[PDB]
A paper describes a structure:
Influenza virus replicates in the nucleus of infected cells where the heterotrimeric viral RNA-dependent RNA polymerase, with subunits PA, PB1 and PB2, is responsible for replication and transcription of the single-stranded viral RNA genome (vRNA). For influenza, cap-snatching involves the binding of host cell pre-mRNAs via their 5′ cap structure to the PB2 subunit of the polymerase followed by cleavage at nucleotides 10–13 by an endonuclease activity which resides in the PA subunit of the polymerase. The endonuclease domain is at the N-terminus of the PA subunit and has a core fold similar to other two-metal dependent nucleases of the PD…D/E…K superfamily. Here we describe high resolution X-ray co-crystal structures of the 2009 pandemic H1N1 (pH1N1) PA endonuclease domain with a series of specific inhibitors, including four diketo compounds and a green tea catechin, all of which chelate the two critical manganese ions in the active site of the enzyme.
Residue numbers in the entry: 0 to 52, 70 to 138, 141 to 196
Write the structure that this text describes.
């Protein structure tokens, strides 16, 4: 059962944020278990990406995984102090070094298409897509992180993928992203 996997594979904080998020949108984590696990994955990658952070003490501000009220407080704080334009939707991070917001995507399809669907849904937000195929794609080929950091994100995705596969959950998870 994909539900049981999610609760074994991901830390309880991540799992809880995934539930809250699904319920906010009216979805039952016990029925839409593939989506449940997708959300956990997007969450964990955002935090991983966050935790990689010479000059600045914390290079990234984390925005995903917060209640919307705090998310916008943090986003408006950053905007009102750095002067950067205010997004129309909440992104996932802010980069203090490059002074821009980042929208992380995670797909189990080919990056190039998911990238495009993301970009259309936003415009000054830097997009960075990962996939379970091991690929990635970022606006203007600027991957923000070093290669050490990205490889760790990619390992984690592949680690999730093998643990799914071993329990035959993978192929469903792969097909459900429609
Ligand atoms: O975080 C994911 O969902 C968030 C919660 C959510 C939901 O509950 C229902 C719904 O209609 C939309 C929805 O948008 C949220 C979301 C936030 C993101 O930052 C994001 O990149 C995204 O694809 C989406 C997510 C990410 C994914 O990458 C993904 O494949 C997935 O199935 C889900
Ligand atoms: O609801 C506030 O905090 C949390 C965030 C939040 C949200 O994002 C969307 C939503 O549908 C409800 C919602 O409730 C949350 C909340 C958290 C609590 O710990 C709590 O006791 C509560 O009554 C509720 C809140 C309300 C306020 O009126 C307020 O001034 C404030 O600073 C914060
Ligand atoms: Mn987000
Ligand atoms: Mn995202």
């Amino acid at each position: 059962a994909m539900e049981d996997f999610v609760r074994q594979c991901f830390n309880p904080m991540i799992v809880e944020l995934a539930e809250k998020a699904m319920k906010e949108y009216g979805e039952d984590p016990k029925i839409e278990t593939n989506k449940f696990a997708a959300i956990c994955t997007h969450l964990e990658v955002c935090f991983m990406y966050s935790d990689f952070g010479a000059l600045l003490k914390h290079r990234f501000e984390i925005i995903e995984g917060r209640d919307r009220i705090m998310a916008w407080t943090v986003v408006n704080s950053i905007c009102n102090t750095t002067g950067v334009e205010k997004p129309k939707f909440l992104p996932d991070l802010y980069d203090y070094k490059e002074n821009r917001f980042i929208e992380i995507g995670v797909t189990r399809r080919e990056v190039h298409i998911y990238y495009l669907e993301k970009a259309n849904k936003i415009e000054k937000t830097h997009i960075h897509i990962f996939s379970f195929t091991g690929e990635e794609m970022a606006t203007k080929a600027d991957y923000t992180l070093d290669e050490e950091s990205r490889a760790r994100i990619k390992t984690r995705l592949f680690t999730i993928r093998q643990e799914m596969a071993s329990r035959s959950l993978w192929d469903s998870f792969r097909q459900s992203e429609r």
